[PDB]
Amino acid sequence: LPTWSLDSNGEMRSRLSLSEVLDSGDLMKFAVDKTGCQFLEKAVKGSLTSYQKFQLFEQVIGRKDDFLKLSTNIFGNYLVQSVIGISLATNDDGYTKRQEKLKNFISSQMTDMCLDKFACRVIQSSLQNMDLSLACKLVQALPRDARLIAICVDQNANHVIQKVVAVIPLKNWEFIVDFVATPEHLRQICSDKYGCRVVQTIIEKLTADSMNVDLTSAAQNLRERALQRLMTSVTNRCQELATNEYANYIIQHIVSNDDLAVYRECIIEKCLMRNLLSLSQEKFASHVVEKAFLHAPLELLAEMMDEIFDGYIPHPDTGKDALDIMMFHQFGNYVVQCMLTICCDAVSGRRQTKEGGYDHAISFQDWLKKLHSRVTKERHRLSRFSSGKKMIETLANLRS
RNA sequence: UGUGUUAUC
């Protein structure tokens, strides 16, 4: 801090005025100092005269180098955001030029700012607060090459993409959907901790749910086509994604969401059916298998149940079957518990059994009897395990 | 008995 602003204690004077700082030419020293920026931040929330605003506009968001220096600063980024807000609230003759400047500064350094822990906050608040037509121009400044992957998997920058998805119409960011849907990009992004969150947010925004009822029918058509293109790519890589440590959450999201029912069915047919025994023994995919049981339409659920009960040839020596393997497997046991709970819910009326012009209660009763008979026969071994005690208790509670 | 994301003074 400039000496003029310090007391005899070597500490920022109290009773300092905003205008003194603005007049001094020393704002940049205050804005990058914890105490100095705290003062500016409080000062700019109060009444400001036209000239005070003018000075703040010039000094904080008026020149490219200083704008970038504050935007990328741990303290300064807050002041930048405050001054952008004041700029947008001040409809004098300078309004247009100030916002165009801000758009040019950010666009010209878009990737660098998105990747920065602090400047990415400036980007997000600009996207949601600036006039929409100018915010759309920021989106246009996003890179279209390998840097876009870098942004999508970055701990900071992924939040910029999620903000774009939230507050900008789809036509402006449709290019991101197609970028992410490219096979090699999908693989990289979905297999990343942050990238997987970005893809789920995109899918959510492309879903025709109660949150999108305000779209025009033309916008719904745009959305439906983008969703269909993304789902095609996800479905093409379903097996790889379902078994992955992060992308399994995406596959689960799709399978679990009734508003994605047509895609849920594709996924189940494409990579789960005929692979249930194998996938139920996988750490990540076993959760996908549970979601499929829980949400499959009746005709597919029947195929799934039939696969577990009768889809596999028992061991040639021991006679162990798929149910035997799954009941005692470290991951498979949860899938069998899920099957049992579904059947108990159906027969007790906690789950609707009518669908497809028929009451399928008879099917659930059949599957339940098979599970009950197995659990009865194998009660001694099952009672050795928490999972087995749980199934025994589940069946006991049903009788009650 | 079994997995992640939700990030600044």
Q: Provide the terminal-to-terminal Cα distance of chain A, rounded to the nearest Å.
A: 76
Burial A233-256 (b: 16+ CB within 10 A, else e): bbbebbbebbbbebbbbbbbbbbe
Whole-number Å distance between alpha carbons of A136 and A253: 29
Residue A194 Cβ under 7 A from any strand B atom: yes
How far apart (Å, rounded) are the C-alpha atoms in residues A68 and A86? 18
- Name the CA radius of gyration of chain A, rounded: 29
Task: For Cα atoms A39, A41, A47, give the angle at the middle one, nearest 5 degrees.
Answer: 100
Nucleotide nearest A79 (Cα, C1'): B9
List the nucleotides on chain B closer than 7 A to a protein CB: 1-9
Nearest DNA or RNA nucleotide to A249 (CA to C1')? B4
Residue numbers in A 336-375, CB below 7 Å of strand B: 337
* A146: number of Cβ within 10 Å: 10
Contact A130, A88 (CB under 8 A): yes
Q: Residue A157 CA to B6 C1' — how many Å?
A: 14
Domains in chain A with CATH codes: 1-400 (1.25.10.10)
| CA A371 – CA A110 distance, rounded (Å) | 58
Q: CA A27 – C1' B8 distance (Å)?
A: 21
CA distance A344 to A350: 8
Cβ count within 10 A of residue A270 = 16
Question: Strand B closer than 7 Å to the CB of A291?
Answer: no
Please check whether strand B approaches the CB of A52 to within 7 Å: no
Q: Is A143 exposed, middle or buried (0-12, 13-18, 19+ CB in 10 A)?
A: middle
Find the Cα–Cα–Cα–Cα dihedral A11, A17, A19, A24, rounded to 10°: -20
Distance in Å, residue A118 CA to nucleotide B8 C1': 6
Count of other CB atoms within 10 angstroms of residue A211:
11
A41 touches strand B (CB under 7 A): yes
CA nearest to nucleotide B6 C1': residue: A197
Distance B1 C1' – A383 CA (angstroms): 13
> According to the 3-state scheme, what is the secondary structure of chain A?
CCHHHECCCCCECCCCCHHHHHHHCCHHHHHCCHHHHHHHHHHCCCCCCHHHHHHHHHHHHCCHHHHHHHHCCCCHHHHHHHHHHHHHHCCCCCHHHHHHHHHHHHHHCHHHHHHCCCHHHHHHHHHHHCCHHHHHHHHHCCCCCHHHHHHHHCCCCHHHHHHHHHHCCHHHHHHHHHHHHCHHHHHHHHCCHHHHHHHHHHHHHCCCCHHHCCCCHHHHHHHHHHHHHHHHHHHHCHHHHHHCCCCHHHHHHHHHCHHHHHHHHHHHHHHHCCCHHHHHCCCCHHHHHHHHHHHCCHHHHHHHHHHHHHCCCCCCCCCCCHHHHHHCCCCHHHHHHHHHHHHHHHHHCCCCCEECCEECHHHHHHHHHHHHHHHHHCHHHHCCCHHHHHHHHHHHHHHC
For the CA atoms of A310, A316, A317, A323, the dihedral, rounded to the nearest 10 degrees, stands at -20
Q: Method of determination? A: X-ray
Burial pattern A354-367, b for ≥16 Cβ within 10 A else e, equals eeeeeebeebbeeb
Statement: the CB of A182 is under 7 Å from strand B:
no
Query: In whole angstroms, what is the distance from residue A210 CA to residue A301 CA?
Result: 27
Minimum-distance residue to B9 (CA–C1'):
A75
Q: Please state whether strand B lies within 7 Å of residue A71 at its CB atom.
A: no
A391's torsion region: left (phi>0), alpha (psi -120 to 50) or beta? alpha
Q: Confirm if A118 and A74 have CB atoms less than 8 A apart.
A: yes
Residue A124 CA to residue A164 CA, distance in Å, equals: 8
How far apart (Å, rounded) are the C-alpha atoms in residues A119 and A280? Answer: 44
